[PDB]
Design a protein around this ligand. Structure first.
Ligand SMILES: [Mg+2]
Ligand SMILES: [Mg+2]
Ligand SMILES: [Mg+2]
Ligand SMILES: [Mg+2]
Ligand SMILES: [Mg+2]
Ligand SMILES: [Mg+2]
Ligand SMILES: [Mg+2]
Ligand SMILES: [Mg+2]
Ligand SMILES: [Mg+2]
Ligand SMILES: [Mg+2]
Ligand SMILES: [Mg+2]
Ligand SMILES: [Mg+2]
Ligand SMILES: [Mg+2]
Ligand SMILES: [Mg+2]
Ligand SMILES: [Mg+2]
Ligand SMILES: [Mg+2]
Ligand SMILES: [Mg+2]
Ligand SMILES: [Mg+2]
Ligand SMILES: [Mg+2]
Ligand SMILES: [Mg+2]
Ligand SMILES: [Mg+2]
Ligand SMILES: [Mg+2]
Ligand SMILES: [Mg+2]
Ligand SMILES: [Mg+2]
Ligand SMILES: [Mg+2]
Ligand SMILES: [Mg+2]
Ligand SMILES: [Mg+2]
Ligand SMILES: [Mg+2]
Ligand SMILES: [Mg+2]
Ligand SMILES: [Mg+2]
Ligand SMILES: [Mg+2]
Ligand SMILES: [Mg+2]
Ligand SMILES: [Mg+2]
Ligand SMILES: [Mg+2]
Ligand SMILES: [Mg+2]
Ligand SMILES: [Mg+2]
Ligand SMILES: [Mg+2]
Ligand SMILES: [Mg+2]
Ligand SMILES: [Mg+2]
Ligand SMILES: [Mg+2]
Ligand SMILES: [Mg+2]
Lengths: 95, 140, 190, 26, 97, 148, 103, 166, 14
RNA sequence: UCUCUUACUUUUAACCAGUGAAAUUGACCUGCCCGUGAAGAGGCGGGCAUAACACAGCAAGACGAGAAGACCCUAUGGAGCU
RNA sequence: ACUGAACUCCUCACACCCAAUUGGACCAAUCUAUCACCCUAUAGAAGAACUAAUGUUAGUAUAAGUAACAUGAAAACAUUCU
RNA sequence: CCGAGCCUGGUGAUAGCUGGUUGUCCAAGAUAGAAUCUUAGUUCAACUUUAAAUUUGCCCACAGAACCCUCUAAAUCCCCUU
RNA sequence: GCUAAACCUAGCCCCAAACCCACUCCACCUUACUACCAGACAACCUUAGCCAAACCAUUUACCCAAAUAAAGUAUAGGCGAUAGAAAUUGAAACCUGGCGCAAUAGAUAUAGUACCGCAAGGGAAAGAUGAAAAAUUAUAACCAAGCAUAAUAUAGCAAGGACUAACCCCUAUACCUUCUGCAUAAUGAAUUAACUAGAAAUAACUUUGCAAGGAGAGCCAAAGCUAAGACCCCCGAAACCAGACGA
């Protein structure tokens, strides 16, 4: 991911991670199950509904996605009409 | 070079001071002197148990020779000495057998008498005397 | 460490003039395996891991931490009886002999840091007295730090100088956020 | 040359010790 | 034998010289100086580091960007080779990845 | 460094390579999560509770009209000229126990916040400004020192 | 090892346990520097406990040269003539007290 | 390069007392840079060792080697300097006490083998040391007879005592 | 093939 | 050429005089048998063997010296031909 | 019956015997500031340590005084002989 | 030293392949597997290394864990007491 | 004590400043180091390649306009390993050193000298007494590897335990490594002296300072922000292109 560039000497990110995932401010990444739009005629409606759900990642996957990004993608955005605004902060956490 | 080595000869002398009485190139070649001193120290540390075992075997051999010269054996003597409530290690027994023959002969006579009393008690299944020099002392 | 520029620079195995072809075949002769000379393992090569170019150890501390350090140095100089407050740094004749005699009589030590104010408003007597000695120094109220105080044994200040220091050290407390540098005209801050 | 003084001082002390050991003064 | 026989001469140093007795003068001029000049401007040395730390490769990049347009030929070639080597060593080799 | 091999020679693959195996961040198809995030309008929150707190502390005087430069001088909110920020919105979190009575100019004000402001006798003004106007109103001293 | 260092026998110098016991230690020449950070323990010792150590046994004489040096040393001479010179470089007061007591 | 053998003839001794022995003389002399081998010089020195000067000269005059005449001239000039400067009257009352050999400065040349390779031709050089002492030569150490061995064995068997106890 | 290595001559200064 | 080798001369061979190598060397106070071990022991166990030091010839062993084997296999390291 | 370990006990206090790996404490040669100048401490930096890479350079032992090796003879040194 | 030359620059080219990797003490510390044009490598499981938050970790017992023709053992899984 | 060990100066690298030079007479474009005779033709051109994506055919900063935040953002990319701006507030004239070194270090250099090929080209060590060498004196010696002084004396990885004495008595299978297992008959080594091998980001841990704000413009924030400490090797191939050289 180029830890040191040749012009600015900073850290670069992977645009695939940004285009395929979505990081929340709490420290979770929202992904999408693969194969949710291809070959839907041989799958049961239960599987079709399960594939169309925002599934969270794990620990090592979240750590990898954080290491592949810089400090810009780990901030807090205040959009006007953000459907994921209620998922930024995570309450009722006891270790 | 910046802040390089300026006191390497002192380490060489500190290593070689333990190799001032060896034969061959081991007292001059540092590369071999290191290994020689290492093995020497390892053997000197590990030979403590060997020295203790050698001293114990020498004491046992001296006691056995003294018992054979007096007219007894070593296992019977050790048994009669441990059955008479007298705690004397091998060193003092060897020292007496080498320097003080009268007390060693007295100990041999006491051991022979204790062995005879034990044989008599075993053949009689004792009942009444059980040995004059026997009678263990009870410590409460 | 904030004014350190190490000009040490050693060439590597690539900047050394030499080393191009391959000395002796690796499979042919029975010598050691080497591909080029001027290596850190050969004689006359470059340094493997050494100083590469000028290294700058530049780093800045927060202004509040530096102000607190100045206040702590002042408290240390005041508590240990090493702070003599004056009213007007003037001399009758201006000479190093009288100055060092007074310093030895008043029990100060082998060194003392004389601090004035505004630099331009300094008399000529004490200037000519300190221009002939090494332990005695004359720095303005702005050029006062911590290393110069710790290097000397005692400190000498003046009423306007100590007032300036007090207000400049209390300006750090109960203030606004930086936002933009204080070099701007602002409104209340001069 | 090798920059230093403490190791040189220790070496000089060792030389003086060897000198006084080989030639014992009265 | 790599030990010097004769003792070296006593390197006496006057600890109260010019820069020694006047060390740290005019330091931290922004706080108690109504903020006129930054303390980083008092550093004298190479122009590509007056108030900037950086890494080993970042310094070379800054030197080739600021002063790289006014150097020699062999020096510029050596700088480019060193930058290529640092790039290949930092973005290909290493650990903790 | 452990045993020999790539773990000791340093010749290791980049972060994310699983040795020929398709990595985790590749088998997942793309989705419109961050399509045009660099063009969305962001607004810093501002609750009425913090406004009443600033008024009680004295950093916001309720005698003059409050806009953006007054909030920047009072240092209650941090308005960034970059990061695509079109002003500061209003939050109705501090509805109860809010007695201020002062006009305020907010870019985005909700119904509850406007109602709570008008209860005491305040005026809410909804205005829009381009990022240039945001940069001008945030720090007017460098804008005056500019020369334009 | 034992084959590289000389050895001796265990015996008395002049039969001290038979007749009367005498003090083997004679003089104690201390070298404490005037200024420095390597003789603080020796300085504190000479300040607080050297009087008690001298009054404990009258047969031991203590000499304080007070020579400005860098490594504080101590010279201990006995009746047989042996001179054992050890250094108390960077040691506490308790360590120096235990050392002089053992000497 | 170090030269400390030719300077031993300048050690001045204090005047003795009438109740002191005669004390024999010590004459040091040696040459430098001699085109010869150190092994052969050491063989000649071992042939000499502690014998009379006249016997040494006689053995060297009929010794078919290269350094024989060199050592002969060395002994001749040493005896001459002894009888002229070191206060020596008798010419036949001398004997060699110490006689050894050293090594000289060496160079490097080529050898030319039967291919592209070659050798390192190191010009071997050596020296020769000798010391002359006045007085008659000491007799050689006679071999110990059976009586000496018997006495030593009796002493060894009498010196052994009890061990590993008290 | 016919493997063969040529000898190397040292400089004439040693 | 052999059964079945032989008679002489030179180079060469042994000693004397000097220049004087190359490969190679972990250190050796360096014997044999049986048995064991990373599977073929002068350095391990049990036995046999033993005053020390050079010269003159042969190869049985020290898996002896020269080439990181050219024969078999691996390499997402190469090159030639079609 | 006895012999027979690093197992247990006797005076002491007990962190002082696993591959890779990880954590905690000291140690020394350079410069700089602070004290001493028969040599050490407090803090910052390192080209900060070599029993080994058929590692590079210079000195020197074993191999080894080992192999190779010169000059035709007599002589007044004017000559003669194969 | 031509199945394709010498010099310089790309180049300190790359290479899952070989070798080496510098002073002390103490403590902890040994591997159910899956994927890959891969088993000579790599990534993820499991274990090991630090400082914190929570309370339960191990043999636990009467009892519970369809089978079918022909037998079906040594055992295992949850298990407050100790 | 012989061999042989240390003695500092030619200076060497980068900064700030400054823009730096090129015929005493003759010879120098043919066989340069040659004084003198008849076809005048001679430049104006995408660089390539290695590596990486575990191959590789698209792709891979090197492009010569001063900092920074934006920002590694939109974008380009077998949409993948990677590459990468712009719009925008802005960027305080003048001061002579080394917390670098001292001949295996620092330029290769006392020098581009000897030497190798016809040729391009490759290319290495040098110099130590002293105020008076017009003081050729008498001293300053003492430490590594090799030697004599002063050879061997039965038995055994060269070591330990020891006694009145070297041996004699007992025990004990060199060193680092790929390896479950190596002194093994696997790898490296003759020694001494000099040199040589863990360089670093996001995210983490600890300690000061301030605090709903921190931070010397830019960035972060539902207890946060700044600073400091702490960390990630060396050497070794066959291959390819570009510029010049040889019958
Ligand atoms: Mg090069
Ligand atoms: Mg190469
Ligand atoms: Mg160099
Ligand atoms: Mg290895
Ligand atoms: Mg492996
Ligand atoms: Mg690779
Ligand atoms: Mg595949
Ligand atoms: Mg011969
Ligand atoms: Mg074994
Ligand atoms: Mg066998
Ligand atoms: Mg063998
Ligand atoms: Mg091979
Ligand atoms: Mg493969
Ligand atoms: Mg391939
Ligand atoms: Mg290829
Ligand atoms: Mg090809
Ligand atoms: Mg026992
Ligand atoms: Mg135990
Ligand atoms: Mg352990
Ligand atoms: Mg280095
Ligand atoms: Mg180093
Ligand atoms: Mg070494
Ligand atoms: Mg070899
Ligand atoms: Mg080596
Ligand atoms: Mg031979
Ligand atoms: Mg011959
Ligand atoms: Mg490499
Ligand atoms: Mg592999
Ligand atoms: Mg590739
Ligand atoms: Mg721009
Ligand atoms: Mg040089
Ligand atoms: Mg050179
Ligand atoms: Mg020696
Ligand atoms: Mg034996
Ligand atoms: Mg090692
Ligand atoms: Mg291997
Ligand atoms: Mg194997
Ligand atoms: Mg071997
Ligand atoms: Mg092998
Ligand atoms: Mg070998
Ligand atoms: Mg032709």
């Amino acid at each position: 991911l180029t830890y040191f560039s040749a012009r600015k000497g900073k850290r670069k990110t992977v645009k695939a991670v940004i285009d395929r995932f979505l990081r929340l401010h709490c420290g979770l990444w929202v992904r999408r199950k693969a194969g949710y739009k291809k070959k839907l005629w041989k799958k049961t409606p239960a599987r079709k509904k399960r594939l169309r759900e925002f599934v969270f990642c794990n620990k090592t996957q979240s750590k990898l996605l954080d290491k592949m990004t810089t400090s810009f993608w780990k901030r807090r955005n205040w959009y006007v009409d953000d459907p994921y605004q209620k998922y930024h902060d995570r309450t009722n956490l006891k270790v | 070079l910046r802040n390089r080595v300026t006191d390497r000869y002192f380490r060489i002398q500190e290593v070689l001071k333990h190799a001032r009485h060896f034969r061959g190139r081991k007292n001059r070649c540092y590369r071999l002197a290191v290994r020689t001193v290492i093995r020497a120290f390892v053997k000197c540390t590990k030979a403590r148990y060997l020295k203790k075992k050698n001293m114990r075997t020498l004491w046992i051999n001296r006691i056995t020779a003294a018992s054979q010269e007096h007219g007894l054996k070593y296992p019977a003597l050790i048994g009669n000495l441990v059955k008479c409530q007298v705690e004397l290690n091998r060193k003092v027994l060897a020292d007496l057998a080498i320097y003080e023959p009268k007390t060693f002969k007295s100990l041999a006579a006491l051991a022979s008498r204790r062995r005879h009393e034990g044989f008599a008690a075993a053949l009689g299944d004792g009942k009444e005397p059980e040995g004059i020099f026997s009678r263990v002392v009870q410590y409460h | 460490n904030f004014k350190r520029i190490s000009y040490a620079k050693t060439k590597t195995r690539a900047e050394v003039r030499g080393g191009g072809r391959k000395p002796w075949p690796q499979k042919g002769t029975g010598r050691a395996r080497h591909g080029s000379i001027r290596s850190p393992l050969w004689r006359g090569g470059g340094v493997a891991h050494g100083p590469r170019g000028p290294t700058s150890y530049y780093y800045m501390l927060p202004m509040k931490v530096r102000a607190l350090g100045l206040k702590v140095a002042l408290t240390v100089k005041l508590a240990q009886d090493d702070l003599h407050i004056m009213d007007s740094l003037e001399l009758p004749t201006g000479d190093p002999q009288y100055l060092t005699e007074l310093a030895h009589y008043r029990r100060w030590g082998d060194s003392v840091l004389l601090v004035d104010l505004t630099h331009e408003e300094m008399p000529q007597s004490i200037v000519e007295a300190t221009s002939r000695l090494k332990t005695f120094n004359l720095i303005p109220a702005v050029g006062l730090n911590v290393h110069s105080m710790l290097k000397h044994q005692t400190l000498v200040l003046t009423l306007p100088t100590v007032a300036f220091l007090e207000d400049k050290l209390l300006w750090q407390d109960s203030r606004y956020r930086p936002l933009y540098p204080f070099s701007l005209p602002y409104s209340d801050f001069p | 040359v090798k920059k230093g003084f403490r190791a040189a001082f220790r070496f000089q002390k060792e030389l003086e010790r060897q000198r006084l050991l080989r030639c014992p003064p009265p | 034998i790599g030990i010097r026989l004769t003792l070296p001469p006593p390197k006496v140093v006057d600890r109260w010289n010019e820069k020694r007795a006047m060390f740290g003068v005019y330091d931290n001029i922004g706080i108690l100086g109504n903020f006129e000049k930054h303390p980083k401007e008092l550093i004298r040395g190479p122009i590509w580091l007056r108030g900037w730390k950086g890494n080993e490769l970042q310094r070379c990049i800054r030197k080739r960007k600021m002063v790289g347009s006014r150097m020699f030929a062999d020096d510029l070639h050596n700088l480019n080779k060193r930058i290529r080597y640092l790039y290949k060593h930092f973005n290909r080799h290493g650990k903790f990845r | 460094r452990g045993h020999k091999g790539e773990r000791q020679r340093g010749t290791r693959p980049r972060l994310g390579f699983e040795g020929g195996q398709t990595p985790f961040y590749i088998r997942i198809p793309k989705y419109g999560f961050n399509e045009g995030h660099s063009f969305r309008r962001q607004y810093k929150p501002l609750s009425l509770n913090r406004l009443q707190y600033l008024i009680d502390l004295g950093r916001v005087d309720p005698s003059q009209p409050i806009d953006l430069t007054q909030l920047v001088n009072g240092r209650g909110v941090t308005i960034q000229p970059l990061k695509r920020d079109y002003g500061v919105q209003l939050v109705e979190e501090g509805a109860d126990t809010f007695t201020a009575k002062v006009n305020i100019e907010v870019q985005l004000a909700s119904e509850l916040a406007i109602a709570a402001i008008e209860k005491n006798g305040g005026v809410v003004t909804t205005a829009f400004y381009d990022p240039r106007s945001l940069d001008i109103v945030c720090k007017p001293v460098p804008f005056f020192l500019r020369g334009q | 090892t034992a084959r590289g260092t000389p050895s001796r026998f265990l015996a008395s110098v002049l039969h001290n346990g038979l007749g009367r016991y005498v003090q083997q230690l004679q003089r104690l020449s201390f070298s404490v520097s005037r200024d420095g950070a390597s003789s603080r323990g020796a300085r504190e010792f000479v300040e607080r406990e050297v009087i008690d150590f001298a009054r404990r046994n009258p047969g031991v004489v203590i000499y304080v040269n007070s020579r400005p040096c860098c490594v504080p040393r101590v010279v201990a001479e006995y009746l047989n003539g042996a001179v054992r010179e050890e250094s108390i470089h960077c040691k506490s007061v308790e360590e120096i007290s235990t050392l002089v007591q053992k000497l | 390069i170090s030269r400390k053998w030719e300077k031993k003839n300048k050690i001045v001794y204090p005047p003795q007392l009438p109740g002191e022995p005669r004390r024999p003389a010590e004459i040091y002399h040696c040459r430098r840079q001699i085109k010869y081998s150190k092994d052969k010089m050491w063989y000649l020195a071992k042939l000499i060792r502690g014998m009379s000067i006249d016997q040494a000269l006689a053995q060297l005059e009929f010794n078919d080697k290269k350094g024989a005449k060199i050592i002969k001239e060395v002994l001749l000039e040493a005896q001459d300097m002894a009888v002229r400067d070191h206060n020596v009257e008798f010419r036949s009352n001398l004997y060699i006490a110490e006689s050894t050999s050293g090594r000289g400065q060496c160079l490097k040349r080529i050898r030319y083998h039967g291919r592209g390779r070659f050798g390192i031709m190191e010009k071997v050089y050596c020296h020769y040391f000798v010391k002359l002492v006045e007085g008659p030569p000491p007799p050689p150490e006679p071999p110990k007879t059976a009586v000496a061995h018997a006495k030593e064995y009796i002493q060894q068997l009498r010196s052994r005592t009890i061990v590993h106890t008290l | 093939k016919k493997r063969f290595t040529p000898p190397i001559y040292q400089p004439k200064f040693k």
